Amino acid sequence: ICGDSTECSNLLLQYGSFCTQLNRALTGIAVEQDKNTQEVFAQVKQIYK
Amino acid sequence: EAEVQIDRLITGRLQSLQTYVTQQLIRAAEIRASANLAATKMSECVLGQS
Amino acid sequence: ICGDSTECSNLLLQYGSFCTQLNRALTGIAVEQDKNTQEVFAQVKQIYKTPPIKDFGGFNFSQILPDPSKPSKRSFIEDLLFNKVKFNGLTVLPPLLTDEMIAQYTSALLAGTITSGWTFGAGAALQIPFAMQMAYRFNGIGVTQNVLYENQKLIANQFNSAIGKIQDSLSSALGKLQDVVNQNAQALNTLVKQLSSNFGAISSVLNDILSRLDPPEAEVQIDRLITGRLQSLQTYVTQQLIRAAEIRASANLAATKMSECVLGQSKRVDFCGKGYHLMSFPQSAPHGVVFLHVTYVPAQEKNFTTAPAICHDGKAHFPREGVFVSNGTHWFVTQRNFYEPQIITTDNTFVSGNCDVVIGIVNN
Amino acid sequence: ETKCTLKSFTVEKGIYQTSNFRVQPTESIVRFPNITNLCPFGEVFNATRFASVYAWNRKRISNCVADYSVLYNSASFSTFKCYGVSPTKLNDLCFTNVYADSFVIRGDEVRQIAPGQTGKIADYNYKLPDDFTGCVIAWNSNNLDSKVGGNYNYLYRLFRKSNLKPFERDISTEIYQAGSTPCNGVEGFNCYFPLQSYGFQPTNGVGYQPYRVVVLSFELLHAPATVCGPKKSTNLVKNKCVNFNFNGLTGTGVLTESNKKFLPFQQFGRDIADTTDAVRDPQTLEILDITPCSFGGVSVITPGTNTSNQVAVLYQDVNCTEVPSNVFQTRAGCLIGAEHVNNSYECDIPIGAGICASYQTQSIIAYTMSLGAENSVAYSNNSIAIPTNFTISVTTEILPVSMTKTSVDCTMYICGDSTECSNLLLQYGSFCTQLNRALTGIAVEQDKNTQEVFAQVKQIYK
């Protein structure tokens, strides 16, 4: 949003927790992508040869 | 005079980011339903006979 | 948005019907929460009760059967699970089924399966003694019935000792149920904490813009609050739709597992536990269900040497339902999952062809 | 009200949220703490000996509780004029400093104590600025200050070089010099002593008798605060939705006796999520909880207008004693217009917490839905049940495959054939391109949906 400027950050501080929610939403997505792969591929106890 | 314009810029740029995040949320639930189908296939077609 | 003030409420009329849509959305997701529970738990027509004298062949179900001296007539393990896990315009509606009703449903499922096997999920319940039901389930995984009947006390002791460990491991894990509670509370708190932001106004209180501003100047400041609060409410309502669509798929999987693991024996690999599925038992939890999966796991393997067929009198013989094995000097037939050698006869083999097209034939 | 909520003339069976119930606040109350320093004016308005007119006094009243009502209504004052501010609103304002000036003049000289006057008093004895703010009070004092033979102790200045600046004071006693001739500190023609004395005597006509005057001047420098009126306090009632104000805290709700213990400097308590939920009464210093005034949705239960026009009403999570026959209390609220029976049926219209309603027993009634009929299985350890016949069953199952493919032109929806609007819409970027791309991708998915269900066969078999 702002981006470097400082007149922008104090004005955006007036909107509450809108940016904390968005970062939580994106972090949940990123943690889900590793569990997707663990559930598909790590389906084996030993590494067989 | 400038605070008025900067608030318009802020409003637009926050709307864009909300659109982006909502669509990523809808698109990740579609990838999860696909990885769930893959896990069931790996269990039932690779670790057994169906 | 307004909090009982006619000035804000008249300005709000200029926004159309956004607030009838938001309520329609929340009502649509509050009705499907009761639809979710109805399809996991109301999978019986009758409420079955278990017999007073309980002799199930050495198997002991006392920690999962209902307990009258307990709260809500829950089982002993349903208690460990229930122990581990007013504002402005915000209310919480109660669920249609109480917890007592859901514990009643799971005790009817559990008394149906202990007593009739899988027959009550296909029609009228037909009773069968519990060890004969266990023998049918062993047949369903490809072991013969004498292997159950000759190992009854050992199989019953292993089952009792393994039900005793669930109770320790829980009494001493319900993170998937805790997370959905936490997410909903974290969202409801963020909704209320937004009632104290300006969004570019002189204050956050309507009794402060209606006290140091004349009506022509307070409209401009009230609209800045209206826009922000509408945005925040609509963000709350979108994220609830996206979270409810995920709870719905989980409940749809739970309803399939109740059908396929509790009212049947599944052959799907790793769908009702890890091993070979024997049977499953349901238990109710705060906003979900716990399945206890009982499976068979083979142990203590030996190697032998094998052949595909046996040549005799110029003919090739194949086993009817087993494998040919050799202990070093002699040749037997076993069943494939449990070692039990037999003499090769013309009753457990069949013939097809002459013994020069198969590769690996042995003479015997 | 249900027909209006649905916008129809036929409602089908169900349960509908129709409105809301909000208990109103009967009355309102205010409160504050007892008073201590209410300012003892009874020293400036109750002195035994006033001050001259040429050297007035100057008391600087300070942080206190000033009650200008005991002044305003005392009816003992012959003159009470207020200039910056009308008198009745004094006990409702706060300033930084109040000054009180005191002196004694003739009776008909009280009209020169006002902003913008002239005369021997206002010229050079006591001058009031032209934007005065305070009030001027004056009362006759013939019996105290006038004495037989003449009271020659009350002087005034009658010659000065130049009129005073406002609130300026001059107690010098130099020999005035009227003419051009220098005076050298001795009297004579055009060399006059500058002070004269009222010779007050008790047999003087009014307008010749001494009046005592007090000039209050409220000033507001730039401090943080100071003395002001004595904000009274009304009674306080509890256990009723009320509109309250606790020395600044404005709110609504039911007030109740508490059993928490603040620390002896804390005024009110807050909850998690930051809402005021306790206060301390300033006057009696006791803690009181603040609970919200009962409120909740209203739902209407109807068997359908094609069956009956009777109705039952649910007040959601409201205690059934504060709603404004059959009144029935539920874990889901208060139900009116249905009778509670002891039977148990299959659920018909879901109320909640295990309770359903039906139109059965020509009316409406509540009950704890039944899960099903009970059944003991004749289990023993050598008994088996084996079927001797069968039935063939056919049942249906219905599934949605597809929905309606719709598109919206984002530009024609918003502007609708208007170039003035279209060029302003270009300042938002790619919102309409995004919207059309989203809507088109779900129209393509719908044909894939029905290809995946129905085209599962290679040949057309007959």
Added chain:
Amino acid sequence: EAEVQIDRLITGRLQSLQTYVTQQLIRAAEIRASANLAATKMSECVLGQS
């Protein structure tokens, strides 16, 4: 002064349209799960015995 009034209409109508499109995207994902289940029933119940 036409511009200041036109901008509020643009702002309101854009938000209306965005709400419509988001709720269509959430509903199409529910229809897709249903159609996948119906495809699986067609394969497993009509083209075989389950």
Added chain:
Amino acid sequence: AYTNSFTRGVYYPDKVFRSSVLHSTQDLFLPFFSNVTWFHANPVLPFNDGVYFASTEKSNIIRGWIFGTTLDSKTQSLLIVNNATNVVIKVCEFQFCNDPFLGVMESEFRVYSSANNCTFEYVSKNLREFVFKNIDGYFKIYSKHTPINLVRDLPQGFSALEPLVDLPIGINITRFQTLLALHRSAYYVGYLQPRTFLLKYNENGTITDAVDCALDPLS
């Protein structure tokens, strides 16, 4: 000398009761583990943003402070004093001794030599902490009196400071001093900065612990 505070200079940010609630605040605090001057027995110090101030004794050598910008006439200043009687707040224009103090016969007060234009009056071992701040023409004072089991060294521990006074003066402040009772017959000075803290509230509503959220990664 210089010394290290450990967890010192926490005050209740305002009224409003409160219980067990790790409540988060942004305000002017004394950062944890800070560099606090040491004084023995004194000079003109700065103010610049609030002040922490502890002191230790059984007798009473510390007899108040004096504040302001110039500590003389031509501009206004505060004066807070305590003879063996009780506290005397005062706000005039003064003429302060460059080394002002009071004696201990028991005759004293060589502090100032002028008391003009007074705009506010008022009249009426051990560890005694004080927090002084000055916002929007109000001069706030928090304080706490804990008993040490030492005589004159800065101890360790947690103890929140409760508000005492509020003065709507308007005065500007840039400097301050101290006042001591002479011999005729130990104190520290921290400064406050804008920090963010996490306060733990008891069930009676007292602050029992805190976290300074800019000390280290764990915090």
